[PDB]
Structure 1
């Protein structure tokens, strides 16, 4: 029942693309990224660092938006939202609406949008230059339901679409990755990578 945002990779004029830390697959890992699967595996509500890389610095007022969509064709028109349990668990920080799957952690300038026409959720933050001893800016995301949550994602895979935007919201660049929110990301990444090898 909602229009489907593009997931097509688009570096644009600034050469925009994502990067991910190399956190490994130990049983204790809270978030780990598989380049072979283009897939982030993370625990519920834990910090997911996502790097922003550009070839040239975009203008002041540039922002970065995150939105989830279902990966599969039969589900892509459905808004990705938190499940009936988690939307009612009183865990909002006062900024993120309790229905939103994706939050930004530790940024008081995060804004949360309920799109008036598509009803899709997204979270957008201003782009700032890298910290003093760093080559890239990093955003910390949290995912607020498990992939398995009944009445929400319900075991359906999702993509996160990251869009670099100007101050009006016009597209400057786009990238994306699949997400699985699960209890043991390290084990699940190993299993899915071993499966891909077979």
Structure 2
């Protein structure tokens, strides 16, 4: 099972989030992103030093709870029904002409990878636009089992260079749900 532990590594890799009728909102308190289905989720990649050419960025979802971490996160039957992302994949990347949709031969886990690109002129960070294609309610079962998105910075061979992660709740009312959860967190 993929590790969720933060690993800034040698390039000082870490994620940043943007608040984007709320379609996508991030709670620092809960280290949790709340977003609507199939809407743009801007995730920022920050590094202290530019990684080597050929560096890649992979996004993968896993269940948070240890008791279900061996289960593969995938879309529900209803939702697995752009000609690029396989219908079974929860996470899609929007606006990248080099996204690769992968299925691990041994674990059957899904992931989407794009080349790492240095911040463009006029920016201090690199931003990736993710879309979540199924609701937490579809994937969580009775006791709403939460999922985590794990983002890894990798070299051309797949070797780990850095990792960061966040809980994600894909839901109809991101704004309301965040308030409810932060409320309960108090």
| TM-score class normalised by the smaller sequence | over 0.9
Q: Could you say what secondary structure the match of 2:98 adopts? A: coil
Deviations 1:143-190 (A, max 9, x none): 000001169898321000000000111000000000000000001111
> In 2, are the aligned partners of 1:51 and 1:139 still within 8 Å (CA)?
yes
Residues 147, 155 of structure 1: 8 Å contact kept = yes
| Contact residue 111 and residue 124 of structure 1 kept, 8 A | yes
- Listed one character per residue, the Cα deviations across residues 76-131 of structure 1 (whole Å, up to 9, x for unaligned) are 1000000011112xxxx111000000000011100010000110000000011112
CA contact (8 A) 1:41 1:181 kept: yes
| Distance of 1:133 and 1:167 partners within structure 2 | 27
Q: Contact 1:148–1:154 (CA<8 Å) still a contact in 2?
A: no
Q: 1:56 to 1:132 in 2, by over 3 A?
A: same
Q: Which runs of 5+ in 2 are unaligned?
A: none
Counterpart contact for 1:80–1:152, Cα < 8 Å: no
CA contact (8 A) 1:164 1:174 kept: yes
TM-score by length of 1: 0.90
User: 1:81·1:152 contact (CA, 8 Å) conserved in 2?
Assistant: no
* Range with bigger deviation, 150-159 or 115-124: 150-159
Question: Could you tell me how far apart the structure 2 residues matched to 1:98 and 1:156 are?
Answer: 22
Query: SS at 2:66's partner residue?
Result: coil
In structure 2, relative to structure 1, the CA distance for the partners of 1:95 and 1:154 (3 Å cut) is: farther
Q: Tell me, yes or no, if the aligned pair for 2:55 and 2:154 is still in contact at 8 Å.
A: yes
**How far apart, CA to CA, are the structure 2 residues paired with 1:167 and 1:157?**
31
Partner secondary structure for residue 37 of structure 1: coil
SS in 1 for 2:102: strand
Give unmatched runs, 5+ long, in structure 1. none
Residues 1:130 and 2:119 aligned together? yes
Shift of residue 132, structure 1, vs aligned partner: 1.2
Cα 1:6–1:35, aligned 2, differ >3 Å: closer, same or farther? same
Number of aligned residue pairs: give it. Answer: 186
- In structure 2, do the counterparts of structure 1 residues 151 and 37 end up closer, same or farther at CA, with 3 Å as the change threshold? closer
Q: Output the CA distance in 1 between the equivalents of 2:119 and 2:31.
A: 24
The residue number in structure 1 matching 2:12 is: 15
